[PDB]
Every structure is written in C-alpha cells, then in structure tokens.
Design a protein around this ligand. Structure first.
Ligand code: HEM
Ligand SMILES: C[C@@H]1Nc2ccc(Cl)cc2[C@@](C#CC2CC2)(C(F)(F)F)O1
Ligand SMILES: OCCCCCC1CCCCC1
Length: 463
C-alpha cells in the first residue's frame, strides 16, 4: 500500500549505482525484468514511477485518465519553459492553451488553404529540389526538417521558407542541436542531478541559449504581426491568438505574451523535429530493405499512377504503404519514455498508492516492442501490420502518440505528412547508397528523451 517497488535507493544519489551506463531507458528495462510492469526508481532525489506494457499504460492514461493527466517536467528545458506553453502547461493554463492550439488546425481560415493542400504543395517543392540535385549524395537531414517545419510555419506565420535560405537553415540547426543535447547522455544525467549540475558548465546552458534565440525570432515576428493585424481577417495562428488577447480586461487571463511566444515555440519545435526524425529513419530503413521500397513503389504505381500527386484519399486503397509507415513509426520509437506526466491526486493503482505530484513516465516503447503483439519485435517488418491477406491490421499496442488527455495533438497532421511525403517522394524516386543493405547500421546516435537516427548519406534517382 506504499509507492510501487523497485531498487533500494541511496540518500543523495538515488538509484544511481543500479542504472545502466547505456541509458535511462536501458536502465529501466533491466528494472522491469526484476520488478514487473509497475515500479519505482529514484532519479536522484525524487521517486518516479515507471509504467510498462500496453495494459498498464492504458489503465493509467485511459481508465484513470483524470488522475494521470498532469504534465511533469524535463530538467534540461524547464528553466526555459517553467510551466508555460501547451506542452508543459498544467491545470487551467493547459485546458485553455490546448483547446486553442487544437481548434487552430481543426479550424482553418475561411479563404486560406487546406492542411492536405499545404502538404501537397510542400511535397512538390521538395521533389522539384531533389531533381535539382541531379542524383548527388546528400544528407537528407536539412530537407526532412525543412519540409515538416514549413507545414507549421504555414499554419503559424502563414507562409514558408526556401530550402536555400540562410536564417532558416540556422534556425533548423538550433532545433536539431537542441533536441540532440536533450537526448544526450548529459541530458539524461541532468534529469537525475539537475539541482547540482545547474551550477556548472554543460549542455543545459546551450539548450537554454538556443531556446532563447528561437524565442527571440518568434517574438519579433509576433511584433510584426501585431502591426499589420486585421481584426476581421486573421492570417494565421498568431493573428487568432492576438485577437483572444482581446481579453485584456477578463481580469486574470491565460493569454499572456509569455504564453504566445512559448506556445508557438512549443509547436514549431514539436511539429518540426519529430516528423522529420521519423521520415529520416523511414528512408534509412528503405535503404536497408529495398524489397520493401520496391513493393511500396509498386502499390503507388498500381493505385495512384506515375503522374497525379498522391492525396489522403488514396490511403484507404493502399494498405501495404500504410503498414510500412506504421512499422516505421513503431520501429523508429521516437519518444521511448513518452514525456513525463504527474498524478493530479493521491492515486490508487494496482494496489499501490502514488501521491499527488509524483512524476510518472509512460515507457511507451515497451508497448511498441511488446512481443505478445509483434513476433520478433526487435526487427523491422511491415508484416506486423498486415493480416494473412495483406489487409491493414491495426493494433491497440500501436501507441507512438501516447493516449488519453495529453495525447499528441499533431497526430492528424503527422500521419498526413508521413503518408503524403513518403509516397510522393517514392512516386518520383528510388533510393541508393554507397553502403550495402547488409551493412547498414540502424543503431541510433543519441537515445534519451528522443531516439535519434544515425547520420547517413543518400541519393535520389528519378524514375
Ligand atoms: C510521428 C510524429 C509524432 C510523434 C511520434 C509524436 C508523439 C508525441 C508524444 C509521445 C507526445 C506526449 C504524449 C503524452 O503526453 O504522454 C506528444 C505530444 C505533443 N505533440 Fe506530438 N508527436 C508527433 C508529431 C507531432 C506534430 C506533427 C505536432 C504538431 C504541432 C506535435 C505536437 C505535439 C504537442 C504540442 C504535444 C503536447 C500535447 C500536450 O501536452 O497536450 N507532435 N506527441
Ligand atoms: C512531444 C514533445 N514535444 C516537445 C515540444 C517542445 C519541446 Cl521543448 C520538447 C518536446 C518534447 C520533444 C521532442 C522530440 C525532439 C522532437 C520533449 F523533448 F520536451 F519531450 O516532446
Ligand atoms: O543534490 C545532489 C548532490 C550530489 C550530486 C553529485 C553527482 C552529480 C552527477 C554526477 C555524479 C555526482
């Protein structure tokens, strides 16, 4: 009837000396073997409760939704955010920010374009730039970032940036580096001992300087918007929000500038670096499994044809591609420990008691890798999402977007980018590398808050 069991901690160090040099996750995986699906680890001074397996995670996020809906914090970025912006917002600030953030994808501008259409145009620009490389080896990183970021900017600032633009390439670089520093080994140790490390040089200081610098750009852009603002013809997200700041009198209110900047920062960042990451991994996987690429190509050829651009409508008619995409995300396993939650009350769980405000990780990646749902789960295989006839077999253990109240509000957009971008690129190209399939190493560089694929060279060969 106490906190869940786990390794016995030491005062001032916690469970430091039972961890696993590999990582926070590899550590937690070892503990799971000993203590089962629900257990307690002391990350430095605090207890944090781990939940593993799809049954436990659903039980928490869905069945006990009200209790498990709070947001914890990530030590590396907390000094920057400190509770502002939808990702790290709690209580009413979150209720407000979330509602707003959702109803501004799901509610699109009267005259302005569709979400699909924004993506469909991007994809073109992209193919019209892959051709302009005339088949050269390149690192796709900067481009995969470029296309996903332009989808947000489109909604947020009402516009896009050119792939060969400088200030733009500098920004996307601040994102990439920040995300990787958070996912770094220091970044993990920082989770454990931020209290002490705060006072010394290290990545945390860079992640701050980066966040400040992006936020500065957003800030200026907000100022520019406020000047040219038209009360009865809003251009984008920013305009919409500036018009809710119509609530200047109503007295104690959640639409601060701090929220504006921080919220936007929050979206850009999440919407840019996670899809881009998935795509990046997608194409590495295609290099290692050309048979899959070819079989996806065939379906595109057999359902869409070689000319007309793919569209969302086609998705129903083409299961193999969908299954491949699902498998990419499942295997990409982008947010292994999800993002930290907290319990909003003294909370009863499988006979244990988790006190109000205890941090709770939902080890999402124990779901995606459950052997009971995926034969040989360590291995990349589209079959995982197909029945006996090659029809799409959805499964309730596929939760890369988490569940319940906090669940990704980009799911719609992401699943649309992954489909359109993937199939459009493949429609017009085929993949080549100097490296052989047998020799392609999938092992990530960085494996922390986020799984970051190893850095690779690829070429795009017109079809
Ligand atoms: C395949 C790509 C993506 C994956 C795997 C993914 C995954 C996740 C996960 C695991 C969470 C936290 C779940 C939890 O709270 O327990 C989350 C939340 C969030 N995602 Fe995504 N995401 C993706 C793409 C996107 C996109 C396209 C956007 C659009 C802006 C986005 C914006 C957000 C935001 C703002 C949150 C915080 C939601 C909240 O706390 O209320 N993400 N996502
Ligand atoms: C789902 C979510 N979105 C997000 C948004 C902003 C910031 Cl600073 C960090 C994140 C965060 C992330 C991420 C991966 C790099 C894209 C994080 F790191 F805080 F956990 O995850
Ligand atoms: O508040 C905790 C004080 C002790 C911190 C010392 C550890 C800091 C992280 C690396 C190993 C030593």
């Amino acid at each position: 009837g106490k906190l869940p069991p786990g390794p016995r901690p030491l005062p001032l160090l916690g469970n430091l000396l039972q961890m696993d040099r590999r990582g926070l996750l590899k550590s937690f995986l070892r503990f799971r073997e000993k203590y089962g699906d629900v257990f307690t680890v002391h990350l430095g001074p605090r207890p944090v409760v781990m939940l593993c397996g799809v049954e436990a995670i659903r039980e928490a996020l869905v069945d006990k939704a009200e209790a498990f809906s709070g947001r914890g914090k990530i030590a590396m970025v907390d000094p920057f955010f400190r509770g502002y912006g939808v990702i790290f917002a709690n209580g009413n600030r979150w209720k407000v920010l979330r509602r707003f953030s959702v109803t501004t994808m799901r509610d699109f501008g009267m005259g302005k374009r569709s979400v699909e259409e924004r993506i469909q145009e991007e994809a073109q620009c992209l193919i019209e730039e892959l051709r302009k490389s005339k088949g050269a080896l390149m690192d796709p990183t900067f481009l995969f970032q470029s296309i996903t970021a332009n989808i947000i900017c489109s909604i947020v600032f009402g516009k896009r940036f050119h792939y060969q633009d400088q200030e733009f390439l500098k920004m996307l670089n601040l994102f990439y580096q920040t995300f990787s520093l958070i996912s770094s080994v220091f970044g993990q140790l920082f989770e454990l001992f931020s209290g002490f490390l705060k006072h010394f040089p290290g990545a945390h200081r860079q992640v701050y300087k980066n966040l400040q610098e992006i936020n500065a750009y957003i800030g200026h852009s907000v100022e520019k918007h406020r000047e040219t603002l038209d009360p009865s013809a809003p251009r984008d997200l920013i305009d919409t929000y500036l018009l809710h700041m119509e609530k200047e009198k109503s007295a104690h209110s959640e639409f601060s500038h701090q929220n504006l900047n921080l919220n936007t920062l929050s979206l850009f960042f999440a919407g840019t670096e996670t899809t881009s990451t998935t795509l990046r991994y997608g194409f590495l996987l295609m290099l290692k499994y050309p048979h899959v690429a070819e079989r996806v190509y065939r379906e595109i050829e057999q359902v869409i044809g070689p000319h007309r651009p793919p569209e969302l409508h086609d998705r129903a008619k083409m299961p193999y591609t969908e299954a491949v995409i699902y498998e990419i995300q499942r295997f990409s396993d982008l947010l292994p420990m999800g993002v930290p939650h907290i319990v909003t009350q003294h909370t009863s769980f499988r006979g244990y008691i988790i006190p109000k405000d205890t941090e709770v990780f939902l080890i999402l990646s124990t779901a995606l890798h459950d052997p009971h749902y995926f034969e040989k789960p360590d291995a990349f295989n589209p079959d995982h999402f197909l029945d006996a006839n090659g029809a799409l077999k959805k499964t309730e253990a596929f939760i890369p977007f988490s569940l319940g109240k906090r669940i990704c509000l980009g799911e719609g957009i992401a699943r649309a980018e992954l489909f359109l971008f993937f199939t459009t690129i493949l429609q017009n190209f085929s993949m080549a590398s100097p490296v052989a399939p047998e020799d392609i190493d999938l092992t990530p560089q960085e494996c922390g808050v986020g799984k970051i694929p190893p850095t690779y060279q690829i070429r795009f060969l017109p079809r």
